[PDB]
């Protein structure tokens, strides 16, 4: 059935897209984490609060 | 014959990927809120983080 095949192909596109979005948001989180790690020494408590969110 | 297995398998993958995506986005939104609360601080490290959020 062509309807089923189209549905499959559509889902495939959707999977690729969601994967892209997921990696896109995760990438931001990772870069943010790295920045917080660089500033562990400094007394900037907001960064620790950002860190807590990352590990939540 | 033709198999409906693919559809159901892909649908599970879609829901699992959506969950992960929404999970990471939620954190980003939480972080955006923390930065918005500290706008007056004019913190250079926060500014860098803010730029990443909106990149």
């Amino acid at each position: 059935a062509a309807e089923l095949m189209q549905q499959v192909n559509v889902l495939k596109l959707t999977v690729e897209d969601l994967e892209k979005e997921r990696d896109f948001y995760f990438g931001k989180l990772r870069n943010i984490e790295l920045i917080c790690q660089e500033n562990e020494g400094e007394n900037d408590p907001v960064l620790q609060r950002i860190v807590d969110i990352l590990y939540a | 014959a033709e198999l409906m297995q693919q559809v159901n398998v892909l649908k599970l993958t879609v829901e699992d990927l959506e969950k992960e995506r929404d999970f990471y986005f939620g954190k980003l939104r939480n972080i955006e809120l923390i930065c918005q609360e500290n706008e007056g601080e004019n913190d250079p490290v926060l500014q860098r983080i803010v730029d990443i959020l909106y990149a």
């Binding site: 559509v10 889902l11 959707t14 969601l18 979005e21 | 879609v14 995506r21 929404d22 939104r29």
Partner: peptide, 13 residues
Amino acid sequence: TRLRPPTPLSQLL
């Protein structure tokens, strides 16, 4: 909020 909101699941299918 200036974050890129995730595309809705209603869309893309």
